[PDB]
Amino acid sequence: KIEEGKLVIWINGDKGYNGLAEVGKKFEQDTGIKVTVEHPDKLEEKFPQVAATGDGPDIIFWAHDRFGGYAQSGLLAEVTPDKAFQDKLYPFTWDAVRYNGKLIAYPIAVEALSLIYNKDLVPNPPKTWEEIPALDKELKVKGKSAIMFNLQEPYFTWPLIAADGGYAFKFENGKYDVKDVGVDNAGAKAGLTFLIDMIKNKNMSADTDYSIAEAAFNKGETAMTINGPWAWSNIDKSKVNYGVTLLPTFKGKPSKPFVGVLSAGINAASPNKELAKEFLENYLLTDQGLEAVNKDKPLGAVALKSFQEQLAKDPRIAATMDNAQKGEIMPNIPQMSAFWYAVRTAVINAASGRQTVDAALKDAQSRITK
Ligand SMILES: C[C@H]1O[C@H](O[C@H]2[C@H](O)[C@@H](O)[C@@H](O[C@H]3[C@H](O)[C@@H](O)[C@@H](O)O[C@@H]3CO)O[C@@H]2CO)[C@H](O)[C@@H](O)[C@@H]1N[C@H]1C=C(CO)[C@@H](O)[C@H](O)[C@H]1O
Known part of the structure; x- marks a missing residue:
């Protein structure tokens, strides 16, 4: 009691x-x-x-x-x-x-999540996701990387999955339609495929979590991270001169963080x-x-x-x-639980290579709309 x-x-x-x-x-x-x-x-x-x-x-x-x-x-x-x-x-x-x-x-x-960047490593932060691999290639010469962020929680990858058309629940006839889910549409797959391609090309590692990404950014090891306002005070205490800016676009569309x-x-x-x-x-x-x-x-x-x-x-x-x-x-609907847990599994399986992007998101879609 x-x-x-x-x-x-x-x-x-x-x-x-x-x-x-x-x-x-x-x-x-x-x-x-x-x-x-x-x-x-x-x-x-x-x-x-x-x-x-x-x-x-x-x-x-x-x-x-x-x-x-x-x-x-x-x-x-x-x-x-x-x-x-x-x-x-x-x-x-x-x-x-x-x-x-x-x-x-x-x-x-x-x-909302923003792009957080080290002003001294990247004076002009990238406007697009597509340019980040080239940025990483240049930074690697100096033993640095372009970007690190938490790949374990779907909150952080969602803005890129949503960019080209992914969504959770469609709002229709004045309410969220719990059977109209957008996790395995073409947009969602395009975004998750880009993330997976970054992993395959060693721009990022599938095992990166909140702590790893935070330590790497705050120690000046990676040029950029993706995080929310709660993270700023640890960066304030660090040696990093950082800016907070618009997330990069994907296929010419804005990243769409869930607010x-x-x-x-x-x-x-x-x-x-x-x-x-x-x-x-x-x-x-x-x-x-x-x-x-x-x-x-x-x-x-x-x-x-x-x-x-x-x-x-x-x-x-x-x-x-x-x-x-x-x-x-x-x-705020109850089915947000089904959505988040299913998406979490999909991102982890695709990033690890346990499933393809298509098979992972199709399984997530089936789980959510049960
Ligand atoms: C899988 C995960 O889904 C749900 O978590 C989501 C939150 O409900 C959202 O609000 C959002 O969380 C972010 C906060 O809004 C933000 O203020 C900051 O704290 O960062 C948060 C993200 O880390 O997004 C979350 C999805 O990433 C659900 O509430 C949560 O219970 C679920 N996580 C559990 C699941 C497993 C797997 O069985 C465990 O590994 C985790 O420890 C659990 O926390």
């Missing part, structure tokens, strides 16, 4: 959890209520397990794509911001957290729903609260208009929004 008279918060380990705990400390100073911030391994998989028995945190942070599944399962409370509070955030961010007519979380930040809205949901089993609302509305979603988290690990563009206005001038934030505008906001 969840303890009454305290708040327990779960947030992903790549986010500014120490900054969030500082907001928790302010809450405690004011109200005497203890806030415990945790970053469990695989929290987004553990949550539906424990919440189903009336357990888990009072508040869970994730991108909104997970939240439709949680709400469908009865695991999230309807949030009750008044009109004046809703007016403080951008309308589209509330749309991301609306499920079957109900608001089921508070939006916090708007995340996530970092959101805070209240456990339907929480005996602390009022405290959660007070914390989220009156502590976190303030200039001071967001600043605390943002100083720890950057949130990106934020949902809170007053604070976003202060961030807007930063070229990294401009680049984030430019990439977001080329991409699409993720569905």
Whole structure:
């Protein structure tokens, strides 16, 4: 059972959890209520397990794509911001957290992947994916590579798979059609084939993950990476002079990152729903609260208009929004789970050579539309 008279918060380990705990400390100073911030391994998989028995945190942070599944399962409370509070955030961010007519979380930040480049290694970043192999060939002479990014999580490869026509679920007749999936169309295959060709030509390695890519970029070993705003503060601390820019085009079309809205949901089993609302509305979603988290690990563009206005001038934030505008906001529908897990398997199998691109994506399409 969840303890009454305290708040327990779960947030992903790549986010500014120490900054969030500082907001928790302010809450405690004011109200005497203890806030415990945790970053469990695989929290987004553990949550539906424990919440189903009336357990888990009072508040869970994730991108909104997970939240439709949680709400469908009865695991999230309807949030009750008044009109004046809703007016403080951008309308589209509330749309991301609306499920079957109900608001089921508070939006916090708007995340998109960008191309991150070392200004000293590549003063003029490549406008196209197609030119990157030639760039790699020149950099290899100096024992450097053109690009490294996480090939284990489909989030990072999706912008290239989507570029030429890949999609998750078609929005038709005012809703996502769960039987109209675009993972094995010609566009999707063209994008994944390009990635695989990069691997075959030794521009990248199939085993590259978040840690490997991050270490290589931040140590000046690779010229470019693909990452989101949470990554910037580690690069700030590194010796690398980096820029954040538009993702490269593929076949003349923009890369299309899936846009996530970092959101805070209240456990339907929480005996602390009022405290959660007070914390989220009156502590976190303030200039001071967001600043605390943002100083720890950057949130990106934020949902809170007053604070976003202060961030807007930063070229990294401009680049984030430019990439977001080329991409699409993720569905929050339950079937996003089927989609992501199936795509994950497809990318890993194709990259490793266990399957061809065509066979991997066809199997993903069959799995998702079951
Ligand atoms: C396979 C994976 O799918 C789902 O994960 C997706 C997230 O739900 C999306 O929000 C997005 O995550 C990115 C965040 O939005 C962003 O803020 C940053 O944290 O980077 C994230 C990407 O690393 O994209 C994800 C897809 O890449 C689903 O929620 C998640 O549970 C699934 N991952 C699990 C699956 C396996 C395989 O059995 C395990 O290896 C993993 O440890 C699990 O986490």
